[PDB]
Amino acid sequence: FSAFSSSRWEYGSPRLERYNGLPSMEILGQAAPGKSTGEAMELMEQLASK
Amino acid sequence: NGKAKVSLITSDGIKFPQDGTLEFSDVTVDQTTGSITLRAIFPNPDHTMMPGM
């Protein structure tokens, strides 16, 4: 192989996701204590929005 | 100055230290490939050519 073959290290993601058939990346978190989720969710949406 | 040139990048990713002049242009067409394989004459002080490769 070292005859015809030429190689390198590289980066690749050794896992992948698609969500409804679109490549996805999951996130996970929670509302701050004293904060309800939808408030958090609303903010992701805002931060997701941008 | 017909003196042409050709540069190598050998299979190691490392271009040979210096180019060498294309010797000439065959007039021949490889039947199967229509390959008009030319001739390159390159210097090999170090034997880093090793013909046959």
Curated annotation (Swiss-Prot), chain A:
It is found in: Cell inner membrane. Disruption phenotype: Loss of susceptibility to contact-dependent growth inhibition (CDI); inhibiting cells still contact the target. Induction: Positively regulated by MarA, Rob and SoxS transcriptional regulators (at protein level). It comes from the Bacteria. Belongs to the resistance-nodulation-cell division (RND) (TC 2.A.6) family. AcrA-AcrB-AcrZ-TolC is a drug efflux protein complex with broad substrate specificity that uses the proton motive force to export substrates. (Microbial infection) Involved in contact-dependent growth inhibition (CDI), acts downstream of BamA, the receptor for CDI. Its role in CDI is independent of the AcrA-AcrB-TolC efflux pump complex. Homotrimer, with large domains that extend into the periplasm, interacts with AcrA and TolC. AcrA may be required to stably link this protein and TolC. Interacts with AcrZ. Part of the AcrA-AcrB-AcrZ-TolC efflux pump. This is Multidrug efflux pump subunit AcrB. It comes from Escherichia coli (strain K12). The chain holds residues 801 to 850 of 1049 of the full protein.
Swiss-Prot record, chain B:
It comes from the Bacteria. It is found in: Cell inner membrane. AcrA-AcrB-AcrZ-TolC is a drug efflux protein complex with broad substrate specificity that uses the proton motive force to export substrates. This subunit may act as an adapter protein that links AcrB and TolC stably together. Belongs to the membrane fusion protein (MFP) (TC 8.A.1) family. Monomeric in solution. Homotrimeric; interacts independently with AcrB and TolC as well as AcrZ. Part of the AcrA-AcrB-TolC efflux pump. This is Multidrug efflux pump subunit AcrA. It comes from Escherichia coli O157:H7. The lineage of its organism: Bacteria, Pseudomonadati, Pseudomonadota, Gammaproteobacteria, Enterobacterales. The gene is acrA.
